[PDB]
């Protein structure tokens, strides 16, 4: 294994799978909402799931400045544990992403 | 044909699940409204638990059958029509508000 823990507004690859269905599969990226001491201590952690298929969906957040451009799900949230499942830092990604992330997850449930 | 709503109880299969993960059949919270549900049929629920540990984000539901914990920590998009989740009651409106609550804490 190793000793990286996931901080907030991280992007890492992880495998989503198994699946019921329309719930993003697969290895992908994804963004790290969950605070550094949460991710650490309860060893899970809260993300949104990436895909480089953009259609356009009202919960599509574009990420830039990775290797793929594409999009995370704000919709999709994901509670996970990722020291089991493996989670490997991708990367980061800017705080107005990361914080239109988290400002479409209040407009989904808020209501 | 039934569709979740905010603040519904349900009953659905969370399974597969790996890790520390909520596994198994057990109910859960619907923090996503009812049009979206309706449409993506998926939606953000919080698995419950009879097994509270008294961990920070236990959020206590009184009124139900048992008496268990929902789980704000966890909040899971799931696909609810694929897994067939049926409607197991309501949370009480500050029950649902106090979850909203703990999981923008641990976001936002």
Same mark, same amino acid.
């Given at each position: 294994?190793?000793? #990286? +823990?996931?901080?907030? =507004?991280? %992007? /890492? !690859? +992880?495998?989503?799978?198994?699946? *019921?269905?329309?719930?993003?599969?697969?290895?992908?990226?994804?963004?790290?909402?969950?605070?550094?001491? #949460?991710?650490?201590? $309860?060893?899970?952690?809260?993300?949104?799931?990436? $895909?480089?298929?953009?259609?356009? #969906?009202?919960?599509?957040? @574009? %990420?830039?400045?990775?290797?793929?451009?594409? @999009?995370?799900?704000?919709?999709? @949230? *994901?509670? /996970?544990? !990722?020291?089991?499942? =493996?989670? $490997? *830092?991708?990367? $980061? +990604?800017?705080?107005?992403?990361?914080?239109?992330?988290?400002? *479409? /997850?209040? +407009?989904? /449930?808020?209501?």
């Amino acid at each position: 294994v190793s000793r #990286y +823990v996931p901080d907030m =507004g991280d %992007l /890492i !690859w +992880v495998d989503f799978d198994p699946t *019921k269905g329309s719930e993003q599969a697969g290895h992908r990226p994804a963004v790290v909402l969950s605070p550094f001491m #949460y991710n650490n201590k $309860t060893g899970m952690c809260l993300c949104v799931p990436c $895909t480089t298929q953009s259609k356009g #969906y009202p919960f599509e957040v @574009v %990420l830039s400045g990775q290797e793929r451009d594409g @999009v995370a799900l704000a919709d999709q @949230v *994901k509670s /996970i544990a !990722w020291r089991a499942r =493996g989670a $490997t *830092k991708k990367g $980061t +990604v800017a705080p107005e992403e990361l914080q239109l992330i988290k400002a *479409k /997850i209040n +407009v989904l /449930i808020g209501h």
